[PDB]
Design a protein around this motif. Structure first.
Motif, short mmCIF file in Angstrom:
data_model
loop_
_atom_site.label_atom_id
_atom_site.label_comp_id
_atom_site.label_asym_id
_atom_site.label_seq_id
_atom_site.Cartn_x
_atom_site.Cartn_y
_atom_site.Cartn_z
N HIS C 255 -25.46 10.77 4.39
CA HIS C 255 -25.64 11.38 3.09
C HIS C 255 -27.03 11.04 2.48
O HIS C 255 -27.56 9.93 2.65
CB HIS C 255 -24.57 10.90 2.13
N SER C 256 -27.61 11.97 1.73
CA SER C 256 -28.91 11.66 1.08
C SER C 256 -28.79 10.58 0.04
O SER C 256 -27.83 10.58 -0.75
CB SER C 256 -29.48 12.92 0.41
N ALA C 257 -29.79 9.70 0.01
CA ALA C 257 -29.86 8.63 -0.97
C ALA C 257 -29.89 9.12 -2.43
O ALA C 257 -29.55 8.37 -3.34
CB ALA C 257 -31.10 7.73 -0.67
N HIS C 258 -30.27 10.37 -2.63
CA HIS C 258 -30.31 10.97 -3.99
C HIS C 258 -28.97 11.25 -4.59
O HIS C 258 -28.87 11.46 -5.79
CB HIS C 258 -31.09 12.29 -3.90
N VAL D 12 -38.37 23.63 1.90
CA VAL D 12 -37.45 22.64 1.36
C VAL D 12 -37.79 21.28 1.99
O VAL D 12 -38.00 20.29 1.28
CB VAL D 12 -35.97 23.03 1.67
N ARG D 13 -37.95 21.25 3.32
CA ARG D 13 -38.23 20.02 4.00
C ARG D 13 -39.51 19.38 3.55
O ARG D 13 -39.57 18.17 3.38
CB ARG D 13 -38.29 20.21 5.52
N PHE D 276 -31.70 18.09 5.50
CA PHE D 276 -33.07 18.58 5.22
C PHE D 276 -34.10 17.47 5.01
O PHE D 276 -35.25 17.76 4.62
CB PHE D 276 -33.08 19.58 4.07
N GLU D 277 -33.72 16.23 5.35
CA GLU D 277 -34.58 15.05 5.20
C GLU D 277 -35.18 14.73 6.55
O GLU D 277 -34.87 15.36 7.55
CB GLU D 277 -33.78 13.84 4.62
#
Ligand SMILES: Nc1ncnc2c1ncn2[C@@H]1O[C@H](COP(=O)(O)OP(=O)(O)OP(=O)(O)OP(=O)(O)OP(=O)(O)OC[C@H]2O[C@@H](n3cnc4c(N)ncnc43)[C@H](O)[C@@H]2O)[C@@H](O)[C@H]1O
Ligand SMILES: Nc1ncnc2c1ncn2[C@@H]1O[C@H](COP(=O)(O)OP(=O)(O)OP(=O)(O)OP(=O)(O)OP(=O)(O)OC[C@H]2O[C@@H](n3cnc4c(N)ncnc43)[C@H](O)[C@@H]2O)[C@@H](O)[C@H]1O
Ligand SMILES: Nc1ncnc2c1ncn2[C@@H]1O[C@H](COP(=O)(O)OP(=O)(O)OP(=O)(O)OP(=O)(O)OP(=O)(O)OC[C@H]2O[C@@H](n3cnc4c(N)ncnc43)[C@H](O)[C@@H]2O)[C@@H](O)[C@H]1O
Ligand SMILES: Nc1ncnc2c1ncn2[C@@H]1O[C@H](COP(=O)(O)OP(=O)(O)OP(=O)(O)OP(=O)(O)OP(=O)(O)OC[C@H]2O[C@@H](n3cnc4c(N)ncnc43)[C@H](O)[C@@H]2O)[C@@H](O)[C@H]1O
Ligand SMILES: [Mg+2]
Ligand SMILES: [Mg+2]
Ligand SMILES: [Mg+2]
Ligand SMILES: [Mg+2]
Lengths: 277, 277, 277, 277
Positions: C255-258, D12-13, D276-277
């Protein structure tokens, strides 16, 4: 005994609607749910979840004022008509809905029948369940009226004792759908879906996991949403009853039939519906 | 020391009920749960969830008025008897229930004992837990009375100090089940299930994950639901205590025993019960 | 710069407690949480969940009356002392707790400091966070006092500006833990855990997923529960800070840290703690 | 027709922000959400969840007093400005926010426009949605104003009939973004993101799963959070619209498009953003 055919997987597949790229919530309509009272609040959440899961565009829940805060945290997508089911006793609906359901968690009172009479003057399909089911007749109108009794409620509507009903379920359901000029979804194992034009089907899905409070309120909601996204309201009813039972069958693959809670049917529906696309 | 036998997996398998295709919610009965007060509201949700997970047909929760809205969003399948546990102090039950539980989240007051006395005039199994447990005797009646004390509550019921009790748990539990003519579920590691006809068993399941507030309230609920779907109320009690402990063992496979919350037992039960079918 | 050592995985493994088969909830104690006000209700739920996840036996939440119904549906295992944090301003605690935390979601008022003064007359470890953190001194007492400031709160306690603090975090934290005779958990990346006997450690776990409202309230709860199940309160603090950060690292694997919400730390802890057993 | 380019995966990336080890919640700012009324409470929970999921540091929700307890159990990380949207009609904001959104679940009244006028005197990006969208002009100020109309709301703002709008969506959206000097996110399939400096993009993601009540309120929240963690507010808007649509595409891999509930977009975002990271 009348050789009523089953609404099968192949029928469900052939009739479930698409949700096109170019559509907007208005394409799938606004449903009205008249359900939930201070004494029986849960039915509004069960039916609301069933409805919003089932392909409508918007839902207005006309529930008792004190029930509204019980729905919001679980179903923040719903909007409200405060004390809607009570207010509908006093005036015809000003707004236009794609479909309307009335009765889950409502008392079996005359004021509920007054709300039913006002609902029936709208031109859209109308579902009557639970407290809105009574011994009565129905006015000629455009859209279908869909009654969803369990055998006890069918006895209250017709005076056919439950023990006699259960011997000839499809025969009684067809006879009374014809007589009343209503759709009758006669609940139980092998639920009968009887249309007033004489079409009739049996539902092949479902199991004893459903034999617990709240599963019928979920189904009412599911029928309401399906009426909004199917062009043919017959296919909406049939598909709702079918997919409802199929969610219980998915549950019993890895969970005991004793342990299902109705709201979980609505959580299972997303995956089950996908399988029939 | 008395060589009390364990209620084993093989016993559970042989005695868990089916949920037949041809059944309806009435087949599995209506339970009444008299639990939850303004000061101790959580117990009603823990016991309600335990009960509806455990194979009943319907549940009526007689909780304090302000507790009702705390249960609805989590357990919308339950119905209510507003201030039921308080009203039961004043009159015998008018309605017929398959089984009744009283006490979780209720104060240890005389008014609670008055409600107990009225509950006991019903003909169904009755569970007494928590605030309904006191030093008292019981009237001859048809259905079993099931007491679910932890050792502290057993001390309150009998005056056997906890340190003496814990040296001879099965011996004290059998003696007092005989004396009172009640079932006694004497909680803790190796919970003792002592019947007033002299049958007695130990529970082999469970672990320290259960040594946290609320796990007993969940069990009370689980016993209540199981009393509704088992023909033999002895098997209901035994199976409830067994499966409760087994849910904690499933948890500790991939989660630390320090970190279980009681309500999660009810979320785990669907999968655990399936394994014993 | 002072070469403060990291509290490592090996330290956590060597010091996390067992939860023995023969234990009961009394073995793991009753914690008191004085948190949550009408204007800042969320902190009580975040800290309550953190605490009940972290190995205590029972939790009493002394929150504002209107906050209680917001906690119950999410954490039905908790019990309450209605308006407890306010009442603690007026009298010493009558009951005995294993550990106490005060401050999350409380205003920075004199009445909160009066409650702190009454809490400190108990013989148990006490955590002061958020609104309970102020420029003040502490009475000689038996159990540790544990302050959990972020750099802004450390500035409020000491007058060391944040920009100066952040250049020499361990040096200021050690100096003030010594001066106050309190434990200081100085939050941020590489949180400093400074003990008043001069022991000091850095926390190696955690990431920017934690840089969002509510994660500190969760940690306060986690420390409170850990104080109840660890014999050594130093190990409780260290292990709580470590496992808190480790839950954020588990989150960022997929999961993204954001996108982390603090309450999810408590949902992740069961699996993360198991890995260190 | 104007060959408006798509904001693509590669864009986005290249523009999604990092969440550095050395950061704290203050790095990602405090957002203000002015949303939710007694009659339309759900919008505040949908937008609050969207916002806290989307990389802010803190969120203050200025909702109607009776809506606050409906948000807390689901989003205990949020803080509140009691009746904030109403109070903002009467005075300029005293506090400093990183970004502000107004309108979801608010009525289309003059008092809401008075709150809008006060919000616009702050120096930060401001989002206007739903009830805050009206036929009006905007004062020269520092930060962007971002309008998020569906075609019906665009008709209310401009008098361009929906049937004419939908034939030339990008052309009308660009023209009116230029005229008003606002960003316009013109919703629907292929949502148009038109900037007042004449930049314009189409959104390539999303599907009919989004064509249901509440999905726009979620997006408003997502834009609000993204404005707090992106340096360039253009990239925040674009990335929010893109990732919102991508969450619906993830859903339809294994769930029917008929069955999505908006709040689930926020539950899906953690995993989708990570990709997308
Ligand atoms: N078969 C029967 N024989 C004799 N009396 C009967 C009876 N069925 C019902 N009754 C009567 O009904 C009363 C009990 O229900 P009742 O209390 O009157 O309805 P309520 O108060 O409004 O709320 P409920 O507890 O009923 O739950 P529900 O409305 O959500 O369930 P519903 O039935 O609509 O919906 C249940 C749903 O689950 C499905 N379902 C139930 N069991 C199965 C099964 N075994 N296999 C497949 N589907 C099943 C149904 O088709 C339906 O979709 C009693 O008075 C009783 O006499
Ligand atoms: N063993 C003991 N020795 C001395 N004093 C004792 C004691 N056990 C209890 N007490 C006394 O009990 C009081 C504390 O509980 P108390 O506060 O009185 O009960 P309450 O307020 O109504 O709510 P609770 O916090 O008790 O939780 P609960 O009712 O849901 O838990 P229950 O025990 O019913 O249910 C707990 C459930 O978890 C199970 N369980 C607990 N630990 C294990 C384990 N280690 N292994 C397997 N099963 C376990 C039990 O069998 C049961 O099913 C104290 O006054 C204390 O003196
Ligand atoms: N580093 C800093 N530099 C300058 N000013 C600062 C600052 N940190 C805080 N402040 C000040 O603090 C105020 C903002 O917080 P504030 O509003 O004052 O606290 P609150 O209102 O009670 O509720 P919160 O929004 O703070 O969240 P919380 O209490 O749950 O978070 P906490 O910090 O306790 O807990 C957060 C938790 O997450 C952890 N954490 C945060 N970021 C990381 C990271 N990047 N890596 C590892 N761990 C992290 C912390 O260690 C801790 O456990 C501002 O006034 C600001 O000036
Ligand atoms: N295309 C259209 N043609 C004619 N009239 C229209 C129309 N679209 C809207 N309207 C008008 O809008 C009114 C209905 O909505 P309305 O009731 O006015 O808005 P509300 O009461 O504040 O709450 P909602 O029920 O609208 O949901 P929402 O605000 O969360 O949805 P939103 O649209 O912001 O957000 C929805 C979100 O989902 C996305 N989305 C919707 N469908 C798709 C799709 N098919 N493919 C990709 N994305 C989609 C949108 O881009 C957006 O992000 C009607 O009066 C109607 O006339
Ligand atoms: Mg029914
Ligand atoms: Mg107990
Ligand atoms: Mg803090
Ligand atoms: Mg909108």
């Amino acid at each position: 005994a009348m050789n009523v055919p089953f609404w099968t997987e192949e029928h469900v597949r052939a009739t479930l609607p698409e949700r096109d790229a170019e559509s907007h919530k208005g394409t799938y309509g606004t449903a009205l749910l008249l359900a939930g009272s201070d004494d029986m609040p849960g039915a509004a959440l069960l039916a609301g979840l069933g409805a919003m899961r089932s392909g409508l565009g918007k839902l207005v829940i006309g529930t008792s004022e004190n029930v509204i805060p019980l729905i919001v945290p679980v179903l923040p997508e719903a909007t409200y008509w405060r004390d809607g089911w009570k207010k509908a006793a006093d005036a015809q609906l000003e707004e236009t809905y794609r479909a309307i359901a009335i009765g889950p968690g409502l008392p079996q009172t005359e004021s509920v029948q007054q709300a039913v009479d006002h609902v029936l003057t709208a031109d859209c399909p109308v579902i009557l369940d639970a407290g809105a089911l009574a011994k009565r007749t129905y006015p000629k109108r455009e859209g279908p009226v869909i009654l969803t009794p369990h055998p006890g409620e069918f006895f209250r509507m017709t005076g056919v004792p439950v023990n006699e009903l259960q011997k000839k379920r499809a025969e009684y359901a067809k006879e009374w759908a014809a007589q009343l000029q209503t759709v009758i979804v006669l609940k139980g194992n092998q639920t009968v879906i009887a249309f007033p034009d004489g079409d009739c089907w049996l539902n092949p899905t479902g199991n004893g996991a459903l034999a617990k409070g709240g599963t019928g309120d979920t189904l009412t909601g599911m029928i309401l949403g399906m009426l909004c996204c199917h062009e043919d309201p017959k296919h909406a009813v049939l598909n709702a009853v079918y997919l409802h039972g199929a969610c219980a069958e998915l549950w019993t693959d890895e969970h005991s039939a004793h342990t299902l809670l109705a709201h979980e049917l609505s959580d299972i529906l997303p995956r089950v519906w996908k399988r029939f696309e």
